[PDB]
Design a protein around this ligand. Structure first.
Ligand code: B12
Length: 577
């Protein structure tokens, strides 16, 4: 009554690993210990071997991320049984190199990091994950105390960039030699090699994904390749360094008053903005169930390094089946999560009468437009345009002078508060796979709410398009009137406004959601942003803004020209000073 249950305990483990079979993992790694002289053998023996297979497979493209992390789960849970035996014993094994991984300062994005985390322990490296919002201080300090071979920083929103760069200067100033590895949503070949590398005398590499992380972490710890690599990269980052400062025959940059002059043209006297049916701050609620439908799974599969869009990915050739299998496992966890009610999304919406003044929107107390309670600020494209507007989000709102009644809204949500709680649980039982799952869904769940609310606002709450029945697949294409710009995106790069949002809706109170040093959000699975109704409104990016606007924004916000240059760094069309 079994099958593989009659093999040598060593082939048994080696197989249970690849397949990712954890139901015998305890008594299997055990028995193999009794038949082994010293604890550490079952590790460098069956297990370690089980992993090279995965790795072999992963390479020909037979296996995938979903399973890999899944095999690790076994791999870990085994070493997690020999803790007391391996410890109280001889030598206790070794690795290819120990690494300090961490989500930089003020940032709370960590999914891509765990993956890299796990993908590396899967090639036998020791990974010390400090977590998120970690001081450039605690990163290197630990780099020191645990004698790491290389520091890895992870970033997600714009503000983090200045953190990494603050970390390199620190690595330059603190005389560090090891290699700096930088990654995350925001990092790029270019950004690393323009503003980061040239601050760290040591090797400073940028990698695009956990797969390629291994190739670099290899070369960077190779008695051979190291010298031959760091050097190929230094000279590579130079090439791109000089191609980005060629100041290509670029469209000359216009003056802040010119652009502003060339504003979004529209006859407002003739147009009457849709009265927002429901004025006021409201706390909405939706169960996972409700949300499930609105989930755009694509990003999900991109989270799990499975390329392609859904549902086309399911019928894919090389990866399709797994995509199917991965896709199931999730839904499965979702079912559980929706029933027991252990991960509940929350959210808060709101609609306030507004109007346009300069490049900002004025939010009004009551229908009277007598008292200003909050001012949403927006930047304005500052390149030379002809025939087209110099788009500035505020334009899509009936100015003050037109005395026309226009409106604006905002929201914030989250796939659940218990996100972190549930995540840690899996860390506990060493379930990397499920740790990364619960998070990847919360997101989907979060991102999901945003779509739902928006639709409901579009339908009910604001009520300008009550007879709307687009499909989920259509909602994914933005086939509706109006947008929902959110702080950070190119349409409105200034992250601090998320504060204002928190203010209007008093997020903290209705959802518990919070904001951090770098105006990121907690839980990680969160989405906040603005609601615009005017039909012409589009997600048009800011791009580069000159010195004049930064100043004028300075005042507006009531900040220092410098404090603004920080938060806006990406979009500075002039010399970053
Ligand atoms: C799922 C996602 C989210 C999630 C959450 C992730 C989290 N916080 O835990 C949700 C939907 C909730 C979210 C929220 C936000 N987001 Co978002 N999001 C995405 C999306 C669809 C997918 C990328 C993704 O997350 N991949 C999986 C992960 C985390 O992988 P990854 O970062 O790519 O990691 C891979 C490698 O980069 C690597 N890497 C990672 N770390 C390291 C470390 C080292 C050391 C090395 C060598 C390599 C490495 O590991 C991975 C592969 O093996 C992107 C897509 C895109 N299309 O570019 C935007 C995007 C990242 N988001 C963006 C922004 C604007 C925001 C918010 C401010 C929005 C809001 N609501 O107002 C907030 C973030 C604040 C917060 N959460 O506190 C921007 C960033 C632009 C900016 N602001 O500067 C992007 C690029 C959108 C665009 N086109 O501009 N987001």
């Amino acid at each position: 009554q079994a099958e593989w249950r009659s093999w040598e305990v060593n082939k048994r483990l080696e197989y249970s690993l690849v397949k990712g079979i954890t139901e015998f993992i305890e008594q299997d790694t055990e028995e193999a210990r009794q038949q082994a002289t010293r604890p550490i053998e079952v590790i460098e023996g069956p297990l370690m071997d089980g992993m090279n297979v995965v790795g072999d497979l992963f390479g020909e493209g037979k296996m995938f991320l979903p399973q890999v992390v899944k095999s690790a789960r076994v791999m870990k849970q085994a070493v997690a049984y020999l803790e007391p035996f391996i410890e109280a014993s001889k030598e206790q094994g070794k690795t290819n190199g120990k690494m300090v991984i961490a989500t930089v300062k003020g940032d709370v994005g960590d999914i891509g990091k765990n993956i890299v985390g796990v993908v590396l322990q899967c090639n036998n490296y020791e990974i010390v994950d400090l977590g998120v919002m970690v001081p450039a201080e605690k990163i290197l300090r630990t780099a020191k105390e645990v004698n790491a071979d290389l520091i890895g920083l992870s970033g997600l929103i714009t503000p983090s960039l200045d953190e990494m760069v603050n970390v390199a200067k620190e690595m330059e100033r603190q005389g560090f030699t090891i290699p700096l590895l930088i990654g995350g949503a925001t990092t790029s070949k270019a950004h690393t090699a323009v503003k980061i590398e040239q601050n760290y005398s040591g090797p400073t590499v940028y990698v695009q994904n956990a797969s390629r992380t291994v190739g670099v972490v290899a070369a960077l710890l190779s008695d051979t390749q190291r010298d031959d690599f760091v050097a190929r990269t230094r000279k590579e980052y130079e090439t791109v360094r000089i191609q980005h400062g060629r100041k290509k025959p670029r469209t000359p940059p216009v003056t802040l008053e010119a652009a502003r002059d060339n504003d979004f043209a529209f006859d407002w006297q003739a147009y009457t903005p849709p009265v927002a049916h429901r004025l006021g701050v409201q706390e909405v609620e939706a169960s996972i169930e409700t949300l499930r439908n609105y989930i755009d799974w694509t990003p999900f599969f991109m989270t799990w390094s499975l390329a392609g869009k859904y549902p086309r990915i399911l019928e894919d050739e090389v990866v399709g089946v797994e995509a199917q299998r991965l896709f199931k496992d999730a839904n499965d966890m979702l079912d559980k999560l929706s029933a027991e009610k252990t991960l509940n999304p929350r959210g808060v919406v709101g609609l306030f009468p507004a109007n346009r003044v300069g490049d900002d929107i004025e939010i009004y107390r009551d229908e009277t437009r007598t008292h200003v309670i909050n001012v949403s600020h927006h930047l304005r494209q500052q390149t030379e345009k002809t025939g087209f507007a110099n788009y500035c989000l505020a334009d899509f709102v009936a100015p003050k002078l037109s005395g026309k009644a226009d409106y604006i809204g905002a929201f914030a949500v989250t796939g659940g508060l218990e996100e972190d709680a549930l995540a840690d649980a899996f860390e506990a039982q060493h379930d990397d796979y499920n740790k990364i799952m619960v998070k990847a869904l919360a997101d989907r769940l979060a991102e999901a709410f945003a779509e739902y609310l928006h639709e409901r606002v579009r339908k009910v709450y604001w009520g300008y398009a009550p007879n709307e029945n687009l499909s989920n697949e259509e909602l994914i294409r933005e086939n509706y009137q109006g947008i929902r710009p959110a702080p950070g995106y190119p349409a409105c790069p200034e992250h601090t406004e998320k504060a204002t949002i928190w203010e209007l809706l008093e997020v903290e109170k209705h959802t518990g959601m919070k904001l951090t040093e770098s105006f990121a959000m907690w839980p990680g699975a969160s989405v906040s942003g603005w609601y615009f109704s005017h039909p012409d409104s589009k997600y048009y990016a800011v791009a580069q803004i000159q010195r004049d606007q930064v100043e004028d924004y300075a005042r507006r916000k009531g900040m220092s020209v410098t404090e603004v240059e920080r938060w806006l760094a990406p979009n500075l069309g002039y010399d970053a000073d």
